[PDB]
């Protein structure tokens, strides 16, 4: 358990309030740079997004992971990534659970099924 | 630590990276040199392994 | 001391994957070996991928595209899966030209003929457009090394085109595990198992060979000067 | 420390003097003009467990 | 007889954490500190 | 160390840190019988 | 792609610092660990494979005039280190002896051919009036940790063998400081400590280490039984 949780809990930071938006606050090219130039960190409050939600636009589960290979994020961050057939908010950490389950399950799809794709895993 | 800086070293990527998250975790007081986030933490009875 | 030499087998697939297996090993070595190898497979590796993306009509990964079904962001990811290879021995940079038409289904091969380079996965969804759908596509490509976020280099081929995330790391996924077999009155004898997943580019095998050779050369420095 | 003393399995000296002979098989002393005892050291004997 | 340790032997702390052993691991494994010197016993948390 | 297990580093065996000495006591009794008395000599047949 | 500048800074027999500067990202440990591994376990060491004392039949014995006890004796010897100088030297047997009232300490070992009580001192034993001694301890070229109930020793009778502590490498750590050199900043400055008890030079072992790994590398030569289900 303990294990599975940690890699499927995701994080929540606070050095940033007036964050997200239905319509981009100022911009994206800005929303972000405001990151490499301090204040609100990757994951944090918002009405529709966190820096991560934008800094990381991953294609395969691979990437998202290949990312974690290099000290960019830590499985638990909320990154944008296309899984199977659509765009998903989830963490490199949650996704992995699946595949894990999936593969060794045989059908990477029916897996996703039973799974509760978004929420801390547990007993 | 007086032993380590005395040798000539002083924390490396491995360590900081910890302290990197050690703060995001609030066990460490943010906004303080890597070195301190260590002591701060060290005194917190733990450390990097 | 004793103990003989390992037994190196390999259940290859064809282009991707590869269950390589070395057996005979004295405690520890299992990890010792691998781990670092892994840290090379996924690290410094010779490969290519997209570095920029010009799309006649609208600049901004965050805009809209008439005539088109998908949106910029997607063409991006779809463009990544894409992989090309270099036939020219020292030309670390090429420019590609994609041409759209009315109602069709973009394909990775439908990219500017040209000889010097080779499309490796002709098929790819790429995109698909409605009635009279335009899509010029100056897609710049580089000879990279590992992974360099589209947000570290800042590409500058054109003024209304968008840079992207370079995934030119052939080594797309590599996992191992050191189980321990037996060979005599001994049973805790390291048994390594490596598995490298790769795109249609460079075979996993070589993925390894090149890794070692690298890690190898990377030891000749501990020399005695 | 005390536990070890009231248990008696450890060897102490009644009156203060000073040791003369000393080996694994014995310990001779010469207490303050109180003669010269010489208590042996039970070596590798069995318990009950 | 001498008896050293043998995977499985029993041992614990005064604090009531009785715990035997299953894997004597080489000084090559054994999560070590930064200054080289490695730990000894890994005392998982869960049991607390 | 799972559930209540513990890991050790070969290190202690090296330093021979956790070693116990133990003396097992063996005994024997020779009785008086009708089929004869039970002696005890360094002489016993077929023993090579 | 630069070319690394390796640092030679060792001094005494114990301790040694090596440092490869311009190293591409991540490799900082891709090396510092492997070798670290190799060292701390596969470095050819030496020690007392067995011993022998006067009127002693077993390890659990006492001797008149010695405040130790085989154990106390044995545990002070297991540790002792000896330089072999010669390669031929498969193995030899040291030898010591005590008289009247004095205190024992490694340095008292009767020297010979290619030998060197690298570590003098090492209080081996204590004595007073009338203390016999004389030891025919044995030494060997062996690898790693090796128990006493698994090797046994054939050196006459009353030869209570001993637990061998070979790998002369006692302590090893390594640092990865950020580095200054022509390029991008987020590079590695790979350094590796590595202490050493008499036996050899932190260096040598080092050189022996890199080769070792290398050796194991090549094993990844030409494969066999290939082809996988379709």
Curated annotation (Swiss-Prot), chain A:
Origin: domain of life: Bacteria
Family: Belongs to the RNA polymerase beta' chain family.
UniProt subunit comment: The RNAP catalytic core consists of 2 alpha, 1 beta, 1 beta' and 1 omega subunit. When a sigma factor is associated with the core the holoenzyme is formed, which can initiate transcription.
Function, as annotated: DNA-dependent RNA polymerase catalyzes the transcription of DNA into RNA using the four ribonucleoside triphosphates as substrates.
Protein name in the entry: DNA-directed RNA polymerase subunit beta'
Source species of the chain: Thermus aquaticus
Gene transcribed to yield this protein: rpoC
Residues of the whole record sequence present: 786 to 908 of 1524
Swiss-Prot record, chain B:
Subunit structure: The RNAP catalytic core consists of 2 alpha, 1 beta, 1 beta' and 1 omega subunit. When a sigma factor is associated with the core the holoenzyme is formed, which can initiate transcription.
Protein function: DNA-dependent RNA polymerase catalyzes the transcription of DNA into RNA using the four ribonucleoside triphosphates as substrates.
Protein name: DNA-directed RNA polymerase subunit beta
Coiled coil residues, start to end: none
Family: Belongs to the RNA polymerase beta chain family.
Superkingdom classification of source: Bacteria
Residues shown, of full length: 926 to 974 of 1119
Annotated organism of origin: Thermus aquaticus
From Swiss-Prot, chain C:
The protein's Enzyme Commission number: 2.7.7.6
Organism expressing this protein natively: Thermus aquaticus
Group of enzyme by EC: transferase
Family named by the database record: Belongs to the RNA polymerase alpha chain family.
Reaction(s) catalysed by this chain's protein: RNA(n) + a ribonucleoside 5'-triphosphate = RNA(n+1) + diphosphate
Quaternary structure annotation from Swiss-Prot or TrEMBL: Homodimer. The RNAP catalytic core consists of 2 alpha, 1 beta, 1 beta' and 1 omega subunit. When a sigma factor is associated with the core the holoenzyme is formed, which can initiate transcription.
Gene behind this protein: rpoA
Key word Iron present: no
Role according to the record: DNA-dependent RNA polymerase catalyzes the transcription of DNA into RNA using the four ribonucleoside triphosphates as substrates.
GO molecular function, one term: protein dimerization activity
GO BP field: DNA-templated transcription
Protein name: DNA-directed RNA polymerase subunit alpha
Portion of the full-length sequence here: 4 to 228 of 314
Domain-level remarks: The N-terminal domain is essential for RNAP assembly and basal transcription, whereas the C-terminal domain is involved in interaction with transcriptional regulators and with upstream promoter elements.
Residues covered by region (Alpha N-terminal domain (alpha-NTD)): 1-225
A GO CC annotation given for this chain: cytoplasm
Keyword Protein biosynthesis in record: no
Keywords: DNA-directed RNA polymerase, Nucleotidyltransferase, Transcription, Transferase
UniProtKB/Swiss-Prot annotation, chain G:
The reaction(s) this protein catalyses: RNA(n) + a ribonucleoside 5'-triphosphate = RNA(n+1) + diphosphate
Region named Alpha N-terminal domain (alpha-NTD): 1-224
GO annotation, biological process: DNA-templated transcription
The keyword Transcription belongs to this UniProt entry's keyword annotation: yes
EC primary class: transferase
The EC number(s) this enzyme carries: 2.7.7.6
Keywords for the protein's UniProt record, in alphabetical order: DNA-directed RNA polymerase, Nucleotidyltransferase, Transcription, Transferase
Molecular functions (GO terms): DNA binding; DNA-directed RNA polymerase activity; protein dimerization activity
Gene Ontology CC annotations of this record: cytoplasm; DNA-directed RNA polymerase complex
Keyword Methyltransferase among UniProt keywords: no
Function noted in UniProt: DNA-dependent RNA polymerase catalyzes the transcription of DNA into RNA using the four ribonucleoside triphosphates as substrates.
Similarity section: Belongs to the RNA polymerase alpha chain family.
Annotated domain remarks: The N-terminal domain is essential for RNAP assembly and basal transcription, whereas the C-terminal domain is involved in interaction with transcriptional regulators and with upstream promoter elements.
Quaternary assembly: Homodimer. The RNAP catalytic core consists of 2 alpha, 1 beta, 1 beta' and 1 omega subunit. When a sigma factor is associated with the core the holoenzyme is formed, which can initiate transcription.
Official protein name in the record: DNA-directed RNA polymerase subunit alpha
């Amino acid at each position: 358990i303990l294990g599975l949780y940690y890699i499927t809990q995701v994080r929540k930071e606070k050095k940033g309030a007036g964050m997200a938006f239905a319509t981009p606050e100022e911009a994206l090219a800005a929303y972000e740079r405001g990151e490499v130039a301090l204040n609100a960190p990757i994951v944090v409050a918002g009405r529709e997004t966190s820096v991560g939600r934008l800094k990381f636009v991953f294609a395969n589960p691979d990437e998202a992971l290949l990312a974690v290979a290099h000290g960019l994020l830590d499985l638990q961050d909320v990154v944008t990534v296309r899984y199977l057939g659509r765009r998903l908010e989830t963490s490199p950490g949650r996704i992995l659970f699946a595949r894990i389950v999936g593969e060794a399950v045989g059908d990477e799809k029916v897996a996703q099924e039973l799974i509760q794709m978004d929420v801390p895993q547990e007993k | 630590f007086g032993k380590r800086q005395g040798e000539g070293f002083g924390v490396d990527k491995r360590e900081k990276e910890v302290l990197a998250r050690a703060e995001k975790l609030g066990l460490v007081s943010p906004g303080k040199s890597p070195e301190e986030q260590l002591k701060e933490l060290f005194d917190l009875g733990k450390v990097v392994l | 001391s004793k103990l003989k030499a390992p037994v190196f087998t390999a259940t290859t697939q064809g282009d991707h994957y590869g269950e390589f297996v070395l057996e005979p090993l004295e405690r520890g070595f299992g990890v010792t070996l691998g781990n670092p190898l892994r840290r090379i497979l996924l690290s410094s590796i010779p490969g290519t991928a997209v570095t920029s993306v010009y799309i006649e009509d609208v600049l901004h990964e965050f805009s809209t595209i008439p005539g088109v079904k998908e949106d910029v962001v997607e063409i991006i990811l779809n463009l990544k899966e894409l992989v090309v290879r270099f036939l020219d021995p020292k030309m670390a940079s090429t420019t590609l030209i994609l041409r759209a038409e009315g109602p069709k289904e973009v394909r990775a091969g439908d990219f500017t003929p040209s000889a010097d380079v080779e499309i490796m996965n002709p098929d790819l969804h790429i995109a698909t457009l409605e009635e009279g759908g335009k899509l010029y596509m100056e897609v710049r490509v580089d000879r990279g090394v590992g992974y360099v976020p589209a947000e570290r280099h800042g590409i500058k081929d054109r003024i209304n085109a968008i840079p992207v995330d370079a995934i030119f790391s052939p080594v797309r996924r590599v996992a191992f595990q050191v189980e321990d077999t037996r060979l005599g009155q001994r049973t805790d004898l390291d048994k390594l198992t490596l598995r490298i997943w790769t795109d249609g580019s460079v075979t996993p095998l070589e993925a390894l060979n090149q890794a070692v050779a690298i890690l190898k050369e990377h030891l000749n420095y501990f020399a005695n000067p | 420390e005390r536990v070890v003393r009231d248990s008696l399995a450890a060897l102490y000296a009644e009156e203060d003097g000073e040791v003369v002979k000393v080996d694994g098989t014995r310990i001779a002393v010469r207490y303050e003009d109180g003669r010269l005892v010489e208590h042996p050291l039970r070596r590798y004997a069995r318990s009950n467990q | 007889q001498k008896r050293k340790l043998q995977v499985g032997d029993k041992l614990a702390n005064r604090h009531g954490n009785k715990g035997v052993v299953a894997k004597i691991l080489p000084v090559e494994d054994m999560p070590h500190l930064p200054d080289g010197t490695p730990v000894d016993v890994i005392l998982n948390p869960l049991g607390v | 160390n799972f559930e209540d297990a513990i890991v050790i580093s070969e290190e202690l065996l090296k330093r021979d840190f956790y070693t116990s000495i133990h003396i097992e006591r063996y005994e024997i009794e020779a009785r008086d019988t009708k089929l004869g008395p039970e002696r005890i000599t360094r002489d016993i047949p077929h023993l090579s």
